[PDB]
């Protein structure tokens, strides 16, 4: 089964720089059968290039396509602010007849900003109901890559947390992230120290915030 | 020229739905017509195609459950979906396809299909109480269906507010957090109320968030 | 029978304008065909390649053209796709053989060979053994085309791009369809 692998998964550039997105096919295909789409949050994809090199209606000249065989490339010359979006490649020649790549997000570049880390115990109201939710908050950081590690009595916790991330902020271009650790009230009262330990480019060393149950 | 989609909604596992795509300008019966879908937060996925001559082809994941068709009199494209599973939840686009003469050049706006088997349920609202800059918030937990709206102090407080995307928990209910950073000297002087509104269940909560 | 004048021609037809050669009043013998090693595909329907040489037919037809590797499976009864529907349609009760071989050495060219074309647009499916060679502009929308290419107004024929480096599904294949017709026999082996 034909597979389109796009790279990099995320591109961070500032306006007026040159953007180069790649698509690699798991088998060799004719260049006639490759297309590129842009998609902005909330909207339907917009066709940009078809036949590897042909500009769709309304595609400005700063967009150009190229490649053949296994390798294809979309170039944005002189990035514009409206060009930050997700970009997909598509083949339409091989079974099942339509395949898309996984997407490249083209995002705004800015200076590294370390997160502010906050930790919140479950409220008494929630505990009364029989579930504890411990929340860890990472605020206004860049870039998006961050490891949040939950530790309960210095035992690292896997498989009972969920993360959530804001879209890049429209004023300072940073990210924010919430991580939630869910326990039953019974398991929550079995332990004392709850900590989230955050690792990020902007932190010289991992920062830990913690609290002791009932303190 | 335009493609307008309709018919999406909430349906249970095993249930049936029918999407419709009224065309304008394009003549559905003279075109390669496709359905493509996008699961929340994921990629594009090709579902189905009908050829102007009547031939039909289907992705593997939907073969035998989904049926594409059209009505030349209404100039509309349809997608009949039977034996729907949770994983069929997505935004569904109809689109016109031109293959080597143009790829997929026109796409409708999309219609949302949710496959759940969860019942309508208003959120529980719990405070995230603060312990330079302080952070405080609201946990809006175990609601269905989407969405909730969250404001702070009835809209008077917007600076520094981050309302995170809802996540789907293993129970099938959604949950989300809303936080705001403030001067920690404001903790003693200003009151912070999150205002949660969940229209499907007609639930409106106002939770006051105080330091513990 | 001059099989070689069909299999060994220098160029082949584009599928939309497939070539039909009548073969009549001669001796058949399918030995150099079946016992050749250079055929990627050689499938028979309604007959049997073993007991082919010892039978008679009123007339035989050899249709020839070039398609992509991935499309050779559409040169069979009860198939669908752009080729079967809009270019070459075999009937459901087909009595004959389909022979295909990879012609990348002959029909690919560095830089792309675009001489071979297929019909992409057509309101209705071809009937069996129909040959449509019109180049009328295809009306995809509501406004008339008046023989002018534009939005919603497409040339119905499109080129394959055959480059030697494409994968075999994108490589050119020469196909010959032998149709046996028992309507006074004149073609025996
Ligand atoms: C085509 O030419 C080759 C050249 O060696 C020959 O062997 C073959 O029999 C020819 N095909 C026929 C006669 O059908």
Residue numbers in the entry:
A (entry chain L): 1 to 10, 12 to 28, 28C, 29 to 108, 108A, 109 to 214
B (entry chain H): 2 to 82, 82A, 82B, 82C, 83 to 100, 100A, 100B, 101 to 127, ...
C (entry chain A): 336 to 518, 521 to 526
Quote the passages of the study that discuss this structure, keeping the authors' original sentences.
To get a better understanding of how CoV11 recognizes SARS-CoV2 spike, we determined the crystal structure of CoV11 Fab in complex with the wt and the delta (B.1.617.2) variants of the SARS-CoV-2 RBD. CoV11 Fab-RBDdelta crystallized in two different space groups, P212121, which diffracted to 2.05 Å, and C2, which diffracted to 2.4 Å. Both crystals had one CoV11 Fab-RBDdelta complex in the asymmetric unit. The orthorhombic delta RBD P212121 crystal form was refined to an R/R free of 0.177/0.208 and the monoclinic delta RBD C2 crystal form was refined to an R/R free of 0.179/0.224. CoV11 binds to the wild-type RBD with an affinity of 2.1 nM and to the delta RBD with an affinity of 2.5 nM largely due to a slight increase in the k off (k d) for the delta RBD; the k on (k a) for both RBDs is roughly equivalent. Delta contained two mutations in the RBD, Leu452 to Arg and Thr478 to Lys. The CoV11 Fab-RBDdelta complex shows that although these mutations sit outside of CoV11’s epitope footprint, they do make small changes to the way CoV11 binds to the RBD. In the wt RBD, TyrCDR H3102 and PheRBD486 display aromatic π stacking interactions, but in the delta RBD, the closer N-terminus shifts TyrCDR H3102 such that it cannot interact with Phe486. The interaction between GluFWR H11−LysRBDdelta478 may partially compensate for this loss. Most other differences are minor, which is mirrored by the less than twofold reduction in binding affinity for the delta RBD as compared to wt.
S1 contains an N-terminal domain and a receptor binding domain (RBD) that recognizes the target cell receptor angiotensin-converting enzyme 2 (ACE2). Here, we describe the molecular basis of the SARS-CoV-2 RBD recognition by the anti-RBD monoclonal antibody CoV11 isolated early in the COVID-19 pandemic and show how its unique mode of binding the RBD determines its neutralization breadth. CoV11 utilizes a heavy chain VH 3-53 and a light chain VK 3-20 germline sequence to bind to the RBD. CoV11 binds the RBD in what has become the characteristic mode of binding for VH 3-53 encoded SARS-CoV-2 neutralizing antibodies by closely overlapping the ACE2 binding site on the RBD.
